[PDB]
Design a protein around this ligand. Structure first.
Ligand SMILES: O=C(O)CNC(=O)C(=O)O
Ligand SMILES: [Mg+2]
Ligand code: NI
Ligand SMILES: [Zn+2]
Length: 331
């Protein structure tokens, strides 16, 4: 068995190996990359996502989210308070202001210490989940707006044609902006490209151990657990590395820098934070190996998780027994 300790693997494809996206994912899996839940892909030196980032300031962040924490430093939830619209140029200036900027630090480890010590005492503003793309249309390799769609994969594997579309999303971050512990919708893959700016630190639980994290979360968030049998689908709960180690939960960590891709694998729980002003692009995708994870994915039916149009068909075809209850949650 490849990668039996479930370590995060880092790949360096050549320009030739970067042509065929599906083939490279299957290669990484042949080496055991999925066992970690997360992999890093450093693009060939010849590749670029676009020519420059000099002209992005007029993108609108229609609903910036202020991430307000409750709890203790290592075990907290966050809620998202909606703020007034602002442009990417306005948001960058805010991120760089004395109130929001990255503090002085020695290295990524010192900054990670500072994040876990102090996150809860601040409410950073995240420009998350913005439909759109920063890949040039002429970038032919690993262009996250040109991937094979999940609807087409389901059709190819299972023969059923379904409605829905699959498009990328932009994330504009600042110091302390936070992504809570989650797996993807329908336990899909994700791919995330850090276009510019400061790094993003990731934490991940191997898929084979995901239920250990779920059991800890039910203990640590006991009211939320009684409210919903899949409350991590709400994407609000944070648990620090120190608390994970104290409770024996297997996990790994890695920092993504500008110009690098990360891939999350089906049922790989992940969480993390931004180091400073940055912009990432991410999209969900599927492969043949995903289908069985899709069939077994938990679902929120309490009403909180509320998701995209395209998840309807995935539930309806892969999980027909759950469909009626799940749809009641959506309506
Ligand atoms: O970058 C973020 O805020 C969150 N991204 C992801 O969870 C992802 O790419 O799967
Ligand atoms: Mg612009
Ligand atoms: Ni994710
Ligand atoms: Zn729920």
């Amino acid at each position: 068995a490849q990668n039996p300790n479930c370590n995060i693997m880092i790949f360096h494809p050549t320009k030739e190996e970067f042509n065929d996206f599906d083939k490279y994912i299957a290669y990484m899996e042949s080496q055991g990359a999925h066992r970690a839940g997360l992999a890093k892909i450093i693009p060939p030196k010849e590749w670029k996502a676009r020519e420059t980032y000099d002209n992005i300031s007029e993108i609108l962040i229609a609903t910036p989210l202020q991430q307000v924490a409750s709890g203790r430093a290592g075990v907290f939830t966050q809620y998202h308070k909606k703020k007034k619209a602002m442009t990417v140029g306005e948001y960058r200036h805010l991120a760089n202001s004395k109130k929001y900027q990255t503090p002085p630090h020695q290295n990524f480890e010192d900054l990670e210490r500072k994040y876990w010590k102090n996150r809860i005492y601040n409410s950073p503003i995240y420009g998350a989940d913005i439909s759109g793309s920063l890949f040039d249309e002429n970038t032919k390799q690993w262009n996250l707006g040109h991937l094979g769609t999940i609807q087409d994969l389901l059709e190819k594997e299972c023969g059923v044609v379904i409605e829905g579309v699959n498009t990328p999303y932009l994330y504009f971050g600042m110091w302390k902006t936070t992504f809570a512990w989650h797996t993807e919708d329908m336990d899909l893959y994700s791919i995330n490209y850090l276009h510019l700016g400061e790094p993003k630190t990731w934490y991940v639980v191997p898929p084979e151990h995901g239920q250990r994290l779920e059991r800890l979360a039910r203990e640590l968030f006991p009211g939320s657990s009684r409210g919903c049998g899949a409350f991590l689908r709400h994407k609000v709960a944070l648990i620090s590395p120190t608390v994970l180690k104290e409770n024996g939960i297997p996990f790994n960590r890695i920092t993504q820098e500008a110009g690098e891709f990360m891939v999350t694998f089906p049922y790989g729980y992940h969480a993390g934070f931004n180091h400073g002003f940055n912009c990432a692009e991410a999209i969900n995708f599927a492969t043949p190996r995903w289908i069985d994870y899709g069939k077994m994915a938990s679902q929120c039916s309490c009403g909180e998780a509320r998701v995209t149009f395209s998840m309807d068909a995935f539930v309806r075809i892969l999980q027909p027994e759950r469909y009626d209850l799940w749809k009641r949650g959506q309506d």
